[PDB]
Structures are given as C-alpha cells and as structure tokens.
C-alpha cells in the first residue's frame, strides 16, 4: 500500500498547490544571527524568532538578483512547491513573506550541516553509510515524482544532516511541476544527465541519473565525471565511460551502471517496474525500506550538537547587510509569492 499512501499524499499536496500559503511572517519577527550558507542566488541565515525563541534558517533572495539571473518562474516554483510538500526527508518551510527588496523563505534549521562538508572532511562514506542516505533519496524521489515534481539539483551541498543523522533535502530552486518533458538547461555540471546537456528535452529520469552521481560521489569521495572546467565535465558525461574505485563492491558497480545509463530505455528508475528496480537491487538487499521511511534505522553518523543555535557544523561566511529599499521592487512579478 505504497499506492494508498501516495494517493492521499497527492490529495494533500494538490490542496496546497492549488491554494498556496502566503505572507505568514515578517522580517521584524526575527533576529538575524549568522549566515549558514550562500547559494547561487541569495543567502541562508540562522535567525531567532522573537516570540517563540525558536531558531530557523532564513533563505533571503534579492528580487533584483532573481530577475537578473532570469529566475522568476523558478523562484515562484520553488516556494509554491516547498509550501505544499510533506515528507520525512524534505525540509519544512515554516514561513514565507516578501518586502520591498527581498523574498524570504523560512525553513526548519537543520543543524547537522551539509552532507558536503562531512563528505569532504571524512573523505568518503562506507557503502553502508552511503546506502543509508541513498535509501532516503530514493524514497524522496519516489514521493516527488508521484506528484509530477522534478527536483533537478541533487548534490551533497543541498542535503542537510539532522540531529538524528537523517537527511533533510533543501533547495527547491530548480524543482518543477511537469508531466512529460521540459527543456531548461539547469543544475550542477557534475550532476547533469547527458540528455540535459544535449538539449533533448528531458524528464524525471534526470533525477535518477543524478542519484547515481550522488551514490558514486558519496562512496568514492569524488564524482564520476570531474574536470577543471564545465565543458570538460560535459564531455566526460556524454562520452559516458565511467571508471570505479577498486574498493567498490560488485553490487555497487552494477547499480551504478544501471543509474548512470545513457540509454533512457535502460536507466533504472525509469522503466516498467519504476523505482522497484532500484529498491529491489542487490545493493539495497539489506535496506529495510519501511524502517527507513519510519526513521527507526540507527544512523551511521550523528553530528555533534551544542544546543539551539550551534552552527559549528557549518563553515563561516562573510556577512552582509540586508537592505530594504523604501521603494517596492518587482511587485507584479512576485504577486503570488
């Protein structure tokens, strides 16, 4: 009855997709403490909510920047989708609002930091440790794809570790609701599926490619296609030859061969049995898919926490003022936000 659960999940999503929440807070309800990470657009700050005393992660987007990088539709997508979804490994959007200059998305603060820093620091993850996270993405993409959502920015930088050691997916800036095919060249070069790179028109299968990249990077400690410049990377991806570390298990290599499959007719996640080809692969034979959904599996790694507003699992960033003009910018563009 995954079928049953997904059906009612869809009902719930559609209600919110159709009547999105709006304007549920304002900037002066929060004290801005420290930047937690920057993206390509705007920054995420640790903040304290005055009346509750709760900490959150406030994503701040400058409207004029959003316009300048042609991200208007993407940003409306981002917020419209994030406020409507509900899943154990998706970060929670707690508030949203806008002012003359900026767009604000307030999420639950996930204090364990990025998978990225942990991965670079440790070097690589054991196969059981990688499998534990991968399982969570598999379930998440099952959910998202069932709602006709493509995610399109899977990477360690956008996966957060929580206080239980489970994953929280963040950054829906490239997420999109679509049946069938879309064409936007967007994502992160190391993670692009070859059909994106080749301007084909692509679908939801690009997320299963990216999962392959993720599992490889997690277990190898470096990505399957790397180079000094994006062009060089896309070359490698299109050529499609992949080499594996000597320590990769046979099971892992076979799975990765079915995910990093240039042939859409052959890529796992995509076919007849759908996700089942992935859930039933030998590499996941020891995965208890229900227990994972239920968060009953003991995490292989639990970050150190030093209370409420500890940001020690995050790098430091140079701080900048957050200006709010006395004139409203891009009012029409962002009306539904």
């Amino acid at each position: 009855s995954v079928k049953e659960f997904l059906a009612k999940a869809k009902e719930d999503f559609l209600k919110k997709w159709e009547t999105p929440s709006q304007n549920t807070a304002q900037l002066d309800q929060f004290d801005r403490i420290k930047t937690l990470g920057t993206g390509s657009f705007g920054r995420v700050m640790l903040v304290k909510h005055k009346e509750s005393g709760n900490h959150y992660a406030m994503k701040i987007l400058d409207k004029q920047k959003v316009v300048k990088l042609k991200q208007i539709e993407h940003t409306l997508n981002e917020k419209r989708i994030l406020q409507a979804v509900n899943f154990p490994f998706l970060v929670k959007l707690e508030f949203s609002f806008k002012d003359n200059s900026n767009l604000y998305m307030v999420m639950e603060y996930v204090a364990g930091g990025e998978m990225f820093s942990h991965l670079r620091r440790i070097g690589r993850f054991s196969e059981p440790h990688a499998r534990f996270y991968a399982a969570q993405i598999v379930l998440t993409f099952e959910y998202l794809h069932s709602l006709d959502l493509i995610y399109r920015d899977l990477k360690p930088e956008n996966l957060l570790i929580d206080q239980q050691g489970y994953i929280q997916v963040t950054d829906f800036g490239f997420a999109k609701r679509v049946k069938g095919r879309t064409w936007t060249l967007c994502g992160t070069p190391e993670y692009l599926a070859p059909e994106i790179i080749l301007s084909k028109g692509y679908n939801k299968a690009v997320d299963w490619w990216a999962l392959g990249v993720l599992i490889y990077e997690m277990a190898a400690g470096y990505p399957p296609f790397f180079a000094d410049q994006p062009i060089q990377i896309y070359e490698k991806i299109v050529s499609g030859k992949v080499r594996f570390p000597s320590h990769f298990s046979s099971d892992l290599k076979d799975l990765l061969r079915n995910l990093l499959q240039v042939d859409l007719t052959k890529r796992f996640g995509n076919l007849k049995n759908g996700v089942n080809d992935i859930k039933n692969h030998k590499w996941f034979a020891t995965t208890d898919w229900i227990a994972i959904y239920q968060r009953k599996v003991e995490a292989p790694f639990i970050p150190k926490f030093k209370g409420p507003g500890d940001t020690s699992n995050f790098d430091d960033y140079e701080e900048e003022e957050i200006r709010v003009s006395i004139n409203e910018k891009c009012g029409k563009e962002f009306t539904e936000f």
Partner: peptide, 20 residues
C-alpha cells in the same frame, strides 16, 4: 591516483549551479 587528481583540481569546494 584519481583521488590525487580530484583533490588537486579546481572543483573540490561547494559547487555553483548552472542555468547557463
């Protein structure tokens, strides 16, 4: 080694997106 070549490369930090 592959690792050595990655580590010496310019893409070992947080990666930017494209939309390009």
């Amino acid at each position: 080694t592959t690792y050595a070549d990655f580590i010496a490369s310019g893409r070992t930090g947080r990666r930017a997106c494209i939309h390009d």
